[PDB]
């Protein structure tokens, strides 16, 4: 339909985006569409060794917005595991109206949420790892540019400070991060590149100077110490193959600068960034981090959705759980029970009373609220990252 | 600037779809602009024990048609190995022209190769263990439905027979494929929904029928055999927790149905497949592979893009090497060798002569060829993937 | 299963083998909205079919009890172990039959 | 009903030897009983990661002779594997009749079959390391001595050339092998139980004097040299906790022994002796070997025994496979291939035809041959051990 290899966004509300047997099974049904209500949930298959930080969820709003349909779900940024106390699948969003009236979607939905509640989740370990230090999305370069907006929104709802992209960036109203590249200093020289860095670096923001891309680190920042004055961040983005020892060179540097008594200037870290890399070059003595490749990569989370009632009747197929079902937790001891619908709270000495998660966004195609904003749902998130270390 | 969170190919044509660094370098270059011409080359820092299927680079053409620049490239559809026969680097992409002129497009033209390229190698690979068994791209849904065509678009050119998706069966020219969904059977009964999705396929087609929503395959199995007569496929796409041994199970079915003289009844399986998967449900009996995530999903090759030559002199940053190189192949045993660009052919008794791979797809922005159309590349790979057991 | 049930009389629970042609899950429904003094379901899957035995006996606890019908209990045999003891009563088995 | 906890012919011959639901499953069934015959084929669940060598068969047919039952097996001493050349369950087994007529004798059949099949199975492992050497069953002790008849018979079949079983030793029609206990040496030294030992054993048997019990096996191996003539064979018993390196320690006394001239003393080793024991011990010089635990405690293979067929038509349970069958085998690349009953044999160029294994041995309770003794069992097993390396 486009010039690049996408979907538009009128493509994939059309239905165009999707398996072609939903259409084609939908238009078998014909008639009978009429008198076939459903309730689908979707749940995770996928990785159950680890909690998940839910997001995408805006996108499948926008999405359903309008077809006479109700719909529930657990708010973005919302931290818990994909099986409960008892280990049944938590259902994250449950779509209720005409199986033919939204049938065709089941593609588009969980591509808005596998994809995108992998790379929050991913960002939330490296949050954890970094602890008090400032880390980015620096990831978009290696994943297709059409959804490089909505890596670095999740990135961000993940818990990273800040985002290098430009779409992004205006999507969670903030200001584009970035630094200088190894080109620049390749075309003109370290001392050109850095002067001019430094020269077009105003207030409100920090001057960071790349310094691996011709001397090595350790003389590279003694030559900056000695030359400059207001450089708040050196940026080490050293060549994996010069990589012996990360965390030690990481050291020298910092203790050749303190000699100079220069330890005012900071460190910060940039190339195939993890949150075991960040936690160790963290206790190391960096202290700001770029990451990409392992955010912008995160493995989805694998979804699935499924008919779990039909015209009023619990109904599904074998390996899943039919009936409508609500997601209670504990105010206290973030404790999980996923239950029958028709149970809206539950008592537990253990912490208070559990309280449902579910939260209706959609009363016949139109929404009960007005829906969060980027910053907000990563502030909602940072507090949930609370209860797990 | 959208509805979803995705960048238009406006937006990614106008330099929007990047790291902010890039555009606010060339801002701070200014005049310098006008004398910096350089040329960058894409190489594979990425997984380095794996040979890969380079596909994407429809969209980089797309993208810098027109800018007056120079692009050298392998063709999609070529297979090799990251490094060359004494461990060199390969470079897959040249560009050449005033940095400033294009410099802001690194982000978009890496991520139209990193994630494509890594999905066109998963399919290869799945396609090899396939053998003469034919297997279908399912796996959209479990990325975000944006950039769903490509995902189809490498899958099929590295090896898949067919694909699901509506927008990409329609970029690669072939008709989506499609069997029945267990919505169907939940919502009809089996029955019916059998009765249904056969009475709906047409001649040209093949009949599939989904058999595990309600019943054991091997009594599912039993039941359309003594029940239909014109079903081509049956296909399993067992629950996880009901898949002890999948492959005993599809032996199990397979004798049940031959018992029954209905041995012409051919299996078609699904569901979290991979070559693995794929090559022991073979030689199982399974004939027909759906194949989602393992492909949708497939990591992306780190792809870097250096300056490796300014105004006509080598240089280079620490871990790179300079000067503009071309990528010569044995006409015979395939064996690569980088070399500088001045060289253009080598001889080697080993098997005739060395040829470069590396093909000029834009002149002063113009296109110097028809590309290539889906159909074409994938029969390339085919070919090449011959060469790799 | 009518005849283990007439034949079962009182000082003795009920059992009721459920796996022999049906999925698990569904021969539960079955039983659940069929009868009423049983006891006992006894699942006593294939080997082949024991994908994830712990989700299997969670999905037909949740199903019963949907029904409200928790009252019927789980008994699991075939190829038991202490380690599938332990997982297998952590699911929600109550009763095991152990040979091998 | 007798003095030790053991179940008499007489019990397991009325089905007393069973799992009660057995005969309550029979009762409940009543008047339909005399319409219900079926077929019955026994198969092994058990490891499939090894051949087998059958055994325990004659057990079966005293049992089963006289009820109106048809029996179809392979006969004792046939080595193959569980899953043939297409990985289908090999059926060992096969019981035709009225279900009422035997059904409570599963528990006895089964169990005849599946401990003495370990057995046989491991001693044609012992035997395949021991070579041309000779290796006796000495294993009795470690499991109830009720059974110590069929597990000398067992190993027997499996390879062993002799058993040390008074028992045993009558059923295969062959003379109890013996040597001499340290019991002997502790209550009279070695010197007078070394000679009690050789003025003790007659011709037609060789000597063995057990050395280990007070000296050092290097310097009890001198003074034997030097003491006696007629000493066929030293053995060695090392304790488990002056074992550092058993075959460091055969080295070095058979050393000791030829530079004495002595050489032509063989050496015999016994204790904890496995087939990796066995392999490395020979290669080490001895030439003897008494095995007992590995043998006599064998692991059983998991045999069960379903209903495949009734009265007529085939049936049976979620994964096993219906109908009445029969097992094909190469009559050169012993390749196997289990087929329908209706099928006697198959071409196949790779090696002349195949020809069924399955032999009827009870036709309406009747024997159909005379049963093959022990020594023409074992004849069999080592033709058949052949084709394994
Ligand atoms: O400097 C920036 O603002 C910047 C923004 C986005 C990405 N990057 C670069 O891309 C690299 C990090 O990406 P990755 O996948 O190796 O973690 C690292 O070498 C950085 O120099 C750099
Ligand atoms: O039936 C189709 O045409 C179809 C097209 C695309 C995806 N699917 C389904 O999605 C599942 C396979 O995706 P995956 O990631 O588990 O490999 C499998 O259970 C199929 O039933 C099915
Ligand atoms: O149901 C009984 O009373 C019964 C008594 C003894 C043994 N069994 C069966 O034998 C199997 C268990 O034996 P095992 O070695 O696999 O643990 C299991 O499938 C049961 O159905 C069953
Ligand atoms: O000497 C015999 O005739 C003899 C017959 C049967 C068993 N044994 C002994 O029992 C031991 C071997 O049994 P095992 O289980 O350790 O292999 C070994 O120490 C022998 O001395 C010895």
């Given at each position: 339909?486009n010039?690049?290899?996408?979907a538009?966004?009128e493509?994939?509300?059309?239905?165009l985006a999707?398996?072609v047997?939903?259409?084609?099974?939908?238009?078998?049904?014909?008639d009978?569409?009429?008198?076939?209500?459903?309730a689908?949930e979707?749940?995770?298959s996928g990785p159950?060794?680890?909690?998940?930080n839910?997001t995408?969820l805006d996108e499948?709003?926008k999405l359903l917005?309008?077809?006479?349909?109700?719909?529930?779900?657990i708010?973005?940024?919302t931290?818990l595991?994909p099986?409960?106390?008892?280990g049944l699948?938590?259902?994250?969003?449950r779509?209720?109206?005409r199986?033919?009236?939204?049938?065709?979607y089941?593609?588009?939905?969980?591509?808005?949420?596998?994809?995108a509640?992998?790379?929050?989740?991913k960002?939330?370990?490296?949050r954890?790892?970094?602890?008090?230090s400032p880390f980015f999305?620096?990831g978009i370069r290696?994943?297709?540019?059409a959804?490089?907006?909505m890596?670095?929104?999740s990135?961000?709802i993940?818990?990273?400070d800040g985002?290098?992209?430009?779409?992004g960036?205006?999507?969670?109203?903030?200001?584009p991060?970035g630094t200088?590249?190894h080109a620049?200093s390749?075309m003109?020289?370290?001392?050109?590149?850095?002067?001019?860095?430094?020269?077009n670096?105003?207030?409100?923001?920090?001057?960071?100077?790349?310094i691996?891309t011709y001397?090595?680190?350790?003389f590279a920042?003694i030559?900056?110490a000695?030359?400059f004055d207001?450089?708040?961040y050196?940026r080490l983005?050293?060549?994996?193959?010069r990589?012996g020892?990360?965390e030690?060179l990481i050291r020298?540097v910092?203790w050749?600068?303190?000699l100079?008594?220069r330890?005012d200037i900071?460190i910060?870290?940039?190339?195939?960034?993890?949150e075991?890399?960040?936690?160790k070059?963290r206790?190391?003595?960096?202290?700001?981090?770029?990451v990409?490749?392992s955010?912008?990569?995160?493995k989805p989370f694998?979804?699935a959705?499924?008919?779990?009632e039909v015209?009023g009747?619990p109904?599904?197929?074998?390996?899943?759980?039919?009936?409508?079902?609500?997601?209670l937790?504990?105010?206290?001891?973030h404790?999980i029970?996923?239950?029958?619908?028709?149970?809206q709270?539950?008592t537990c000495?253990?912490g208070?009373?559990?309280?449902?998660?579910?939260?209706?966004?959609?009363?016949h195609?139109?929404?009960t609220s007005?829906?969060?904003?980027?910053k907000?749902?990563?502030?909602?998130?940072?507090?949930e990252?609370?209860y797990?270390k």
């Amino acid at each position: 339909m486009n010039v690049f290899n996408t979907a538009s966004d009128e493509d994939i509300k059309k239905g165009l985006a999707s398996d072609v047997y939903f259409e084609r099974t939908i238009s078998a049904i014909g008639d009978k569409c009429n008198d076939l209500r459903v309730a689908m949930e979707a749940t995770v298959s996928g990785p159950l060794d680890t909690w998940i930080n839910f997001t995408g969820l805006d996108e499948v709003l926008k999405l359903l917005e309008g077809l006479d349909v109700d719909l529930y779900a657990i708010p973005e940024g919302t931290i818990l595991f994909p099986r409960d106390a008892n280990g049944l699948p938590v259902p994250f969003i449950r779509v209720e109206g005409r199986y033919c009236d939204f049938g065709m979607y089941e593609t588009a939905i969980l591509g808005f949420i596998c994809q995108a509640s992998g790379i929050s989740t991913k960002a939330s370990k490296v949050r954890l790892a970094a602890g008090d230090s400032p880390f980015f999305s620096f990831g978009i370069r290696r994943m297709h540019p059409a959804i490089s907006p909505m890596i670095d929104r999740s990135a961000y709802i993940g818990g990273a400070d800040g985002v290098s992209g430009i779409l992004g960036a205006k999507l969670i109203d903030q200001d584009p991060v970035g630094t200088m590249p190894h080109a620049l200093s390749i075309m003109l020289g370290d001392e050109e590149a850095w002067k001019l860095t430094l020269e077009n670096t105003k207030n409100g923001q920090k001057s960071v100077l790349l310094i691996d891309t011709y001397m090595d680190e350790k003389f590279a920042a003694i030559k900056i110490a000695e030359m400059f004055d207001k450089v708040d961040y050196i940026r080490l983005d050293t060549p994996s193959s010069r990589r012996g020892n990360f965390e030690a060179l990481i050291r020298e540097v910092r203790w050749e600068l303190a000699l100079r008594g220069r330890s005012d200037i900071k460190i910060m870290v940039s190339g195939g960034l993890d949150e075991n890399t960040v936690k160790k070059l963290r206790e190391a003595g960096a202290e700001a981090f770029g990451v990409g490749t392992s955010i912008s990569s995160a493995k989805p989370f694998d979804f699935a959705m499924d008919i779990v009632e039909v015209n009023g009747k619990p109904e599904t197929k074998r390996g899943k759980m039919s009936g409508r079902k609500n997601v209670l937790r504990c105010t206290s001891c973030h404790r999980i029970e996923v239950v029958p619908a028709n149970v809206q709270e539950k008592t537990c000495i253990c912490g208070g009373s559990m309280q449902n998660l579910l939260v209706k966004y959609l009363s016949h195609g139109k929404r009960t609220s007005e829906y969060p904003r980027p910053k907000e749902i990563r502030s909602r998130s940072m507090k949930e990252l609370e209860y797990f270390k």
